[PDB]
Design an enzyme around this catalytic site. Structure first.
Site, PDB file in Angstrom:
ATOM      1  N   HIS A  10      66.208  46.568   9.657  1.00 14.72           N
ATOM      2  CA  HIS A  10      65.182  47.061  10.580  1.00 14.72           C
ATOM      3  C   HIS A  10      65.536  46.967  12.063  1.00 14.72           C
ATOM      4  O   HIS A  10      65.181  47.872  12.836  1.00 14.72           O
ATOM      5  CB  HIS A  10      63.847  46.316  10.344  1.00 14.72           C
ATOM      6  CG  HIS A  10      63.952  44.849  10.565  1.00 14.72           C
ATOM      7  ND1 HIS A  10      64.357  43.983   9.577  1.00 14.72           N
ATOM      8  CD2 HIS A  10      63.783  44.100  11.683  1.00 14.72           C
ATOM      9  CE1 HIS A  10      64.394  42.754  10.061  1.00 14.72           C
ATOM     10  NE2 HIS A  10      64.058  42.800  11.337  1.00 14.72           N
ATOM     11  N   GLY A  70      74.138  41.435  15.732  1.00  8.47           N
ATOM     12  CA  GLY A  70      75.477  41.811  15.213  1.00  8.47           C
ATOM     13  C   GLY A  70      76.210  40.712  14.409  1.00  8.47           C
ATOM     14  O   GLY A  70      77.018  41.036  13.512  1.00  8.47           O
ATOM     15  N   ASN A  71      75.864  39.433  14.648  1.00  7.70           N
ATOM     16  CA  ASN A  71      76.631  38.318  14.091  1.00  7.70           C
ATOM     17  C   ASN A  71      76.380  38.018  12.624  1.00  7.70           C
ATOM     18  O   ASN A  71      77.337  37.892  11.860  1.00  7.70           O
ATOM     19  CB  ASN A  71      76.556  37.045  14.977  1.00  7.70           C
ATOM     20  CG  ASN A  71      77.734  36.953  15.966  1.00  7.70           C
ATOM     21  OD1 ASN A  71      78.889  37.162  15.582  1.00  7.70           O
ATOM     22  ND2 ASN A  71      77.444  36.662  17.264  1.00  7.70           N
ATOM     23  N   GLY A  72      75.116  37.973  12.213  1.00  8.55           N
ATOM     24  CA  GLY A  72      74.779  37.851  10.794  1.00  8.55           C
ATOM     25  C   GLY A  72      75.379  38.998   9.975  1.00  8.55           C
ATOM     26  O   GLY A  72      75.926  38.765   8.902  1.00  8.55           O
ATOM     27  N   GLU A  73      75.290  40.212  10.525  1.00  8.01           N
ATOM     28  CA  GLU A  73      75.785  41.449   9.900  1.00  8.01           C
ATOM     29  C   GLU A  73      77.295  41.417   9.671  1.00  8.01           C
ATOM     30  O   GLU A  73      77.748  41.735   8.586  1.00  8.01           O
ATOM     31  CB  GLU A  73      75.373  42.696  10.705  1.00  8.01           C
ATOM     32  CG  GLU A  73      73.863  42.817  11.006  1.00  8.01           C
ATOM     33  CD  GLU A  73      73.498  42.134  12.374  1.00  8.01           C
ATOM     34  OE1 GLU A  73      73.666  40.924  12.536  1.00  8.01           O
ATOM     35  OE2 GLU A  73      73.110  42.836  13.332  1.00  8.01           O
ATOM     36  N   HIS A 100      94.616  45.585  16.696  1.00 17.83           N
ATOM     37  CA  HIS A 100      95.166  44.297  16.309  1.00 17.83           C
ATOM     38  C   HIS A 100      94.755  43.815  14.930  1.00 17.83           C
ATOM     39  O   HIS A 100      95.542  43.161  14.260  1.00 17.83           O
ATOM     40  CB  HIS A 100      94.716  43.219  17.289  1.00 17.83           C
ATOM     41  CG  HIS A 100      95.326  43.339  18.640  1.00 17.83           C
ATOM     42  ND1 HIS A 100      95.230  42.335  19.577  1.00 17.83           N
ATOM     43  CD2 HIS A 100      96.070  44.321  19.204  1.00 17.83           C
ATOM     44  CE1 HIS A 100      95.864  42.708  20.675  1.00 17.83           C
ATOM     45  NE2 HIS A 100      96.394  43.902  20.468  1.00 17.83           N
ATOM     46  N   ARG A 139      99.616  38.585   9.961  1.00 16.55           N
ATOM     47  CA  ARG A 139      98.388  37.770  10.018  1.00 16.55           C
ATOM     48  C   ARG A 139      97.317  38.281   9.035  1.00 16.55           C
ATOM     49  O   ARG A 139      96.671  37.473   8.369  1.00 16.55           O
ATOM     50  CB  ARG A 139      97.885  37.651  11.462  1.00 16.55           C
ATOM     51  CG  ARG A 139      98.833  36.801  12.294  1.00 16.55           C
ATOM     52  CD  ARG A 139      98.855  37.235  13.780  1.00 16.55           C
ATOM     53  NE  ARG A 139      99.991  36.605  14.453  1.00 16.55           N
ATOM     54  CZ  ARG A 139     100.340  36.802  15.714  1.00 16.55           C
ATOM     55  NH1 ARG A 139      99.638  37.635  16.471  1.00 16.55           N
ATOM     56  NH2 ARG A 139     101.385  36.156  16.210  1.00 16.55           N
TER      57      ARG A 139
HETATM   58  O1  LIG Z   1      64.060  39.268  11.628  1.00 11.69           O
HETATM   59  P1  LIG Z   1      64.375  39.581  13.033  1.00 11.69           P
HETATM   60  O2  LIG Z   1      64.194  41.050  13.351  1.00 11.69           O
HETATM   61  O3  LIG Z   1      63.703  38.678  14.041  1.00 11.69           O
HETATM   62  O4  LIG Z   1      65.965  39.302  13.178  1.00 11.69           O
HETATM   63  C1  LIG Z   1      66.935  40.022  12.398  1.00 11.69           C
HETATM   64  C2  LIG Z   1      68.329  39.643  12.883  1.00 11.69           C
HETATM   65  O5  LIG Z   1      68.498  38.230  12.729  1.00 11.69           O
HETATM   66  C3  LIG Z   1      69.747  37.691  13.187  1.00 11.69           C
HETATM   67  O6  LIG Z   1      69.803  37.832  14.601  1.00 11.69           O
HETATM   68  C4  LIG Z   1      70.948  38.375  12.489  1.00 11.69           C
HETATM   69  O7  LIG Z   1      72.221  38.057  13.096  1.00 11.69           O
HETATM   70  C5  LIG Z   1      70.815  39.897  12.458  1.00 11.69           C
HETATM   71  O8  LIG Z   1      71.258  40.473  13.722  1.00 11.69           O
HETATM   72  C6  LIG Z   1      69.406  40.382  12.094  1.00 11.69           C
HETATM   73  O9  LIG Z   1      69.303  41.779  12.379  1.00 11.69           O
HETATM   74  O1  LIG Z   2     100.234  37.822  19.182  1.00 12.15           O
HETATM   75  P1  LIG Z   2      99.380  38.054  20.370  1.00 12.15           P
HETATM   76  O2  LIG Z   2      99.334  36.866  21.301  1.00 12.15           O
HETATM   77  O3  LIG Z   2      99.587  39.363  21.113  1.00 12.15           O
HETATM   78  O4  LIG Z   2      97.854  38.235  19.891  1.00 12.15           O
HETATM   79  C1  LIG Z   2      97.196  37.198  19.145  1.00 12.15           C
HETATM   80  C2  LIG Z   2      95.747  37.615  18.880  1.00 12.15           C
HETATM   81  O5  LIG Z   2      95.772  38.819  18.101  1.00 12.15           O
HETATM   82  C3  LIG Z   2      94.473  39.370  17.817  1.00 12.15           C
HETATM   83  O6  LIG Z   2      93.862  39.724  19.064  1.00 12.15           O
HETATM   84  C4  LIG Z   2      93.569  38.374  17.064  1.00 12.15           C
HETATM   85  O7  LIG Z   2      92.210  38.839  17.066  1.00 12.15           O
HETATM   86  C5  LIG Z   2      93.581  36.982  17.707  1.00 12.15           C
HETATM   87  O8  LIG Z   2      92.689  37.034  18.845  1.00 12.15           O
HETATM   88  C6  LIG Z   2      94.990  36.514  18.141  1.00 12.15           C
HETATM   89  O9  LIG Z   2      94.887  35.367  19.000  1.00 12.15           O
END
Ligand SMILES: O=P(O)(O)OC[C@H]1O[C@H](O)[C@H](O)[C@H](O)[C@@H]1O
Ligand SMILES: O=P(O)(O)OC[C@H]1O[C@H](O)[C@H](O)[C@H](O)[C@@H]1O
Lengths: 156, 156
Positions: A10, A70-73, A100, A139
């Site tokens: 939602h 965005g984080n839970g998702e 990367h 990696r």
């Molecule tokens: O239930 P409400 O709408 O308050 O929150 C919903 C949200 O909760 C958290 O923030 C999650 O990371 C995710 O983003 C989700 O969309």
């Molecule tokens: O090998 P180099 O230093 O270019 O990159 C290393 C990085 O690669 C990517 O960005 C990964 O998400 C992570 O952040 C890592 O630290």
């Protein structure tokens, strides 16, 4: 033209609708995994897992998961075997997720950005190529192996 | 005072040492999982998996994974069973990771923030309580069950 599986609760629902329209208008193929309507009490994991599962099952496709922060998702999406879901909070991070991490998916917090900012993130995500650089592949391989066995790789 | 497991590759190495100092000075208990030296070519997954593994294994602790962009690091951490690793790119997202997702870990991209911005992110993460709100717990539980069974929850 990329196929892009979209999943939202939602909180990401109205942004998901705008992204579907945007992707259609820019030559891509959005596939909506739900939510298909606004339900204020609905639970993000099902939609994130749906989008991630489809994306991993369709090699060459991409996915976007949308909610409030965005984080839970992205956490949910990353629980799908083979999925790599970045949190895209900028054009740069969306680009780096592709370049990367060869991330097949990103999460976007609909409450953290304006529509225009979110659409710029989407653009970066669907147009930035995977670098294929050896270190990045190594990696991703190490992670893929861990997923297969759950044996923590040794730290030097 | 929180226990905080820290992992970093070469890109997060200097930021990690700075965070270790900060956590000590602010009354917390950092535990370094490596890298213990700068190695320009080292690979983030082992350090992130190490920190996430230790954190999940020690209920009540938190963890922080550090690299260049943050995203590869949180992706790696999230592959650890039971781990919830948020990407913290702001004081707000650090806070919401705890409040909404009961995230035991955050990833931070050392190349994305000044030291002072990073430390403010750290402060928010180690001082913000988990809300324990019903809907947040329900969503975490749904995800935990998916993790346990790999039965994707159904989508309406
Ligand atoms: O239930 P409400 O709408 O308050 O929150 C919903 C949200 O909760 C958290 O923030 C999650 O990371 C995710 O983003 C989700 O969309
Ligand atoms: O090998 P180099 O230093 O270019 O990159 C290393 C990085 O690669 C990517 O960005 C990964 O998400 C992570 O952040 C890592 O630290």
């Amino acid at each position: 033209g990329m196929r892009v599986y979209l999943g939202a609760d939602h909180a990401g629902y109205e942004l998901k609708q705008r992204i579907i329209e945007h992707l259609k208008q820019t030559g891509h193929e959005p596939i909506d995994c739900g939510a298909l309507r606004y339900d204020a009490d609905d639970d993000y994991p099902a939609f994130c897992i749906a989008a991630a599962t489809r994306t991993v099952a369709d090699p060459g496709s991409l996915g976007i998961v949308l909610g409030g922060s965005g984080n839970g998702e992205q956490i949910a999406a990353n629980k799908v075997p083979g999925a790599r879901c970045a949190l895209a909070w900028s054009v740069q991070t969306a680009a780096l997720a592709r370049e990367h991490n060869n991330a097949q998916l990103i999460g976007i917090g609909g409450r953290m950005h304006t529509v225009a900012e979110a659409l710029a993130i989407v653009d970066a995500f669907v147009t930035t190529p995977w670098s294929k650089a050896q270190r990045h592949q190594r990696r991703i391989d190490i992670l893929a192996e861990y997923e297969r066995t759950h044996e923590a790789p040794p730290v030097p």
